[PDB]
């Protein structure tokens, strides 16, 4: 009754704003409903971009220490946390500003409010106010927005653990990115990538680390051999790496937060920390938007299941990004958003989920895509693997990262590449070649005969394929 659109996008994250801009490029009249002032969602405001910005600066600090043995001597740096925090916020504010300008240029209306479904064709938007991301309150004003199509892109939120009380020293990923102080002793609860990245940053800045994980290893889903290389190089940062251990008590006290662990190789006495980072996963927000009032089905865990066109059970309502399933990754959200937008424009478009890369921007990076040794064993798929160790790379040796490696995985029956993994610097920038090779159905001969430049880390992809064919001359005979 207050406004009508071809497409209303609920949430302005990588999924939502990509969907909205794509729909507008197709000539549709679009609106984004986003409860906070800035676009870009979790990835831009409190996720990928600020975390990788801190990680990049931290990695140079680490490189500088290794420069002295090469005759380039620097002291320890003087660290100004206030200027480091402003540098990271300055990257985000440059990007959020650009996104707003791009919305206005594409004539996409941006509404600041909390959206809730009224019926299959209307959102009720409780308008919000506040400029800072994650800090907006309802004004009390309400606006009803009618749509032909809705694209649900309401993302995820930090998973909470019930047994952990509230205390300013107990933080989540957003608290970590706020960079209030460098704690002397930092506990990471949860072994996943997001907490390990934050630990890397704080470790380089001066924090001692512990980490606890109920499951059997860190970075669940990554092949163990990549994680083993990451762990060996990072062991010096940690006083306790505790896997298969339960966290039973978090007790804040005057001089620290005291945490108790039950594990076969975990200490028994409670451990004091200056800060505790809860990074135990993220939960989708499907149950929080009144979707049933639109007829949209939502699972018990809060996911909104979609078909390959990104359609919910309600044919004119789509859903994309973290809220439809794993993996919760920004580049998935973007592509899914393109697919949903083109279907809103009447162009039959489908989303292929087989090749979605994952990257830990730790030091070293851990990048992988497609079939893993873990999944192949779980499904029974017969595979062959080819591994090129960076101990054989003049580039890696010169650069001081000769402990990395590049691994390719092929289907045993067909010979096609179906997966790949890289541990070592720039893995994230190199895994795209593996993604493309899987998409194209390459075999080992396709990749090995492709002439990669020397001396690079990227040529390890071609040489690993040469390993698969038995004709790598930079390694012993195979």
Ligand X SMILES: Cc1cc2nc3c(=O)[nH]c(=O)nc-3n(C[C@H](O)[C@H](O)[C@H](O)COP(=O)(O)OP(=O)(O)OC[C@H]3O[C@@H](n4cnc5c(N)ncnc54)[C@H](O)[C@@H]3O)c2cc1C
Q: Which does 389 bind (CB under 5 to 8 A by kind): a copy of itself, ligand X, none?
A: none
In the complex, the smallest distance separating the C-beta of residue 315 from a copy of itself, rounded to whole angstroms, is 24
Rounded least distance, CB 35 to ligand X, Å = 4
321 binds, among ligand X, a copy of itself, none (CB under 5 to 8 A by kind): ligand X
By CB under 6 A, tell whether 48 contacts ligand X: yes
Does position 129 interact with a copy of itself (CB under 8 A)? The reply is no
Of the candidates 63, 11, 3, the one whose C-alpha atom is nearest the C-alpha of residue 32 is 11
Question: Distance (Å, rounded) from C-alpha 283 to C-alpha 301?
Answer: 8
Report, in Å, the least distance between residue 361 CB and ligand X: 6
DSSP of 356-400? --EEE-SSS-EEEEE--HHHHHHHT--EEEEEEEGGG-HHHHHHT
Q: Does 424 bind ligand X (CB under 6 A)?
A: no
Residues 293/117, Cβ–Cβ less than 8 Å:
yes
149 binds, among ligand X, a copy of itself, none (CB under 5 to 8 A by kind): none
Q: Does 71 bind a copy of itself (CB under 8 A)?
A: yes
Nearer to a copy of itself, 52 or 121 (CB): 52
According to the binding rule CB under 6 A, does residue 333 interact with ligand X?
A: yes
In the 3-class helix/strand/coil scheme, how is 309-366 assigned residue by residue? CCECCCCCEEECHHHHCCCCCHHHHHHHHHHHHHHHCCCCCCCCCCCCCEEECCCCCE
| CA pair distance 417, 396, nearest whole angstrom | 24
Instruction: Say which residue the tokens 């600090």 belong to.
Output: 61
Neighbours of 89 (CB within 10 A): 16
The partner in contact with residue 95, picked from a copy of itself, ligand X, none with C-beta cut-offs of 5 to 8 angstroms by kind, is a copy of itself
Q: Which partner in ligand X, a copy of itself, none is near 11 (CB below 5 to 8 A by kind)?
A: ligand X
Q: Which of 197, 208, 198 is nearest to 360 (CA)?
A: 197
* By the rule CB under 6 A, 289 interacts with ligand X: yes
Binding test (CB under 6 A) with ligand X, winner from 28, 31, 35, 383? 35
Q: What are the C-alpha distances in Å from 320 to residues 10, 42, 120, 349?
A: 10, 14, 18, 14
Let me know if 454 is a catalytic residue.
yes
Size of the site for a copy of itself (CB under 8 A): 97
Q: Given the rule CB under 8 A, which of 150-158, 169-177, 304-312, 324-332 is the region that contacts a copy of itself?
A: 324-332
- List the interface residues with ligand X, window 160-189 (CB under 6 A): 173
DSSP 443: -
**Structure-token pair, residue 343:** 């279907």
Residues whose CB falls within 8 Å of the CB of residue 398, separated by 6 or more in sequence, listed in order: 455
Minimal CA–CA distance to 404: which of 280, 238, 233, 234? 233
14 makes contact with ligand X (CB under 6 A): yes
CB 417 within 8 A of CB 408: yes
146 binds a copy of itself (CB under 8 A): no
168 binds a copy of itself (CB under 8 A): no
Residue 432 touches which member of a copy of itself, ligand X, none, C-beta under 5-8 Å by kind: a copy of itself
Q: CB–CB of 321/356 below 8 Å?
A: no
> Which of 56, 66, 347, 454 is flagged as catalytic?
454
- Asked if 418 interacts with a copy of itself (CB under 8 A), we say no
**Helices 48-67 & 81-105 angle (0-180, nearest 10):** 140
395 neighbors 425 (Cβ within 8 angstroms): no
Q: Are strands 417-423 and 366-370 parallel, antiparallel or unpaired?
A: antiparallel
Q: Does 395 bind a copy of itself (CB under 8 A)?
A: yes
Name the one range near ligand X by CB under 6 A: 294-302, 306-314, 323-331, 340-348.
323-331
Q: Is 11 in the site for ligand X (CB under 6 A)?
A: yes
Give the one residue of 18, 149, 247, 285 binding a copy of itself; rule: CB under 8 A. 18
For 205, the token pair is: 């800045």
Among 8, 22, 51, 250, binds ligand X (CB under 6 A): 51
Instruction: Return the number of the residue (210 or 365) whose C-beta is nearest a copy of itself.
Output: 365
Residue number with CB closer to ligand X (245 or 343): 343
Query: Which residue's CB is nearer to ligand X, number 116 or number 271?
Result: 116
Neighbour order of strands in the sheet with 246-253: 246-253, 256-262, 271-273
Is residue 15 at the binding interface for ligand X, with CB under 6 A as the rule?
A: yes
Tell me which stretch binds ligand X (CB under 6 A): 4-12, 92-100, 141-149, 340-348. 4-12
Give long-range contacts, CB 8 A cutoff, 24+ apart: 80-85: 81/179, 81/181, 81/182, 81/205, 84/54, 84/57, 84/179, 85/178, 85/179
User: Hey, which residues between 333 and 352 contact a copy of itself (CB under 8 A)?
Assistant: 334-335, 337-338, 352
Binding partner of residue 407 among ligand X, a copy of itself, none, CB cut-off 5 to 8 Å per kind: none
- 13 scored as a contact of ligand X (CB under 6 A): yes
Among 8, 409, 423, 430, binds a copy of itself (CB under 8 A): 430
Answer for the pair 283, 156: CB distance below 8 angstroms, yes or no: yes
399 scored as a contact of ligand X (CB under 6 A): no
User: Known catalytic residues?
Assistant: 454
Q: Which residues bind ligand X (CB under 6 A)?
A: 10-16, 33-36, 41-43, 46-48, 51-52, 114-115, 153-156, 173, 194, 285, 289, 321-322, 328-331, 333, 361, 454
């Amino acid at each position: 009754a207050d406004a009508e659109y071809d497409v209303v996008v609920l949430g302005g994250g990588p999924g939502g704003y990509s969907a909205a801009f794509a729909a507008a490029d197709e000539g549709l009249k679009v609106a984004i409903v986003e409860r906070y002032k800035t676009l870009g969602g979790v990835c831009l405001n409190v996720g990928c971009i600020p975390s990788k910005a801190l990680l990049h600066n931290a990695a140079v600090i680490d490189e500088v220490r290794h420069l002295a043995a090469n005759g380039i001597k620097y002291p320890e740096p003087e660290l100004d946390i206030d200027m480091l925090r402003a540098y990271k916020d300055g990257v985000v504010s440059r990007l959020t500003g650009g996104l707003a300008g791009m919305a206005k240029s594409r004539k996409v209306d941006v509404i600041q409010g909390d959206g809730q479904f009224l019926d299959p064709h209307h959102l009720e938007v409780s308008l919000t106010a506040g400029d800072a991301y994650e800090q907006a309150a309802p004004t009390g004003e309400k606006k009803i927005v009618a749509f032909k199509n809705c694209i649900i892109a309401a993302g995820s939120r930090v998973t909470k653990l019930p047994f952990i009380p509230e205390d300013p020293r107990i933080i989540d990923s957003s608290g970590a990115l706020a960079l209030k102080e460098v704690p002397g002793k930092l506990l990471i609860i949860g072994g996943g990538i997001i907490g390990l990245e934050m630990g890397t940053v704080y470790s380089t800045l001066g924090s001692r680390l512990d980490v606890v994980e109920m499951m059997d290893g860190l970075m669940q889903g990554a092949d163990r051999d990549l994680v083993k290389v990451w762990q060996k190089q990072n062991e010096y940062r940690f006083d306790n790496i505790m896997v298969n251990t339960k966290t039973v008590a978090v007790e804040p006290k005057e001089d620290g937060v005291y945490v108790t662990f039950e594990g076969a190789n975990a200490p028994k006495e409670p451990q004091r920390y200056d800060a505790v980072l809860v990074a135990a996963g993220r939960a989708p927000n499907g149950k929080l938007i009144s979707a049933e009032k639109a007829g949209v089905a939502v699972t018990d865990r809060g996911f909104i299941e979609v078909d390959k066109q990104m359609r919910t059970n309600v044919p004119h309502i789509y859903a994309i990004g973290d809220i439809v399933g794993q993996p919760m990754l920004a580049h998935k959200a973007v592509h899914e958003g393109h697919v949903a937008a083109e279907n809103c424009a009447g162009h039959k478009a489908y989303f292929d989920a087989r090749v979605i890369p994952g990257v830990a921007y730790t030091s070293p990076e851990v990048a992988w895509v497609g079939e893993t040794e873990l999944s192949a064993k779980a499904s029974g798929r017969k595979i062959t693997k080819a591994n090129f160790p960076w101990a054989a790379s003049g580039r890696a040796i010169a650069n001081g990262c000769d402990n990395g490696f590049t691994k390719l995985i092929f289907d045993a029956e067909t010979g096609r590449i179906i997966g790949g993994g890289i541990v070592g610097p720039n893995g994230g920038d190199m895994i795209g070649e593996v993604c493309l090779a899987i998409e194209m159905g390459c075999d080992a001969a396709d990749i090995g005969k492709t002439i990669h430049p020397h001396p690079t880390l990227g040529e390890s992809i071609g040489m690993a394929a040469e390993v698969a064919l038995g004709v790598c001359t930079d390694l012993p005979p195979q």
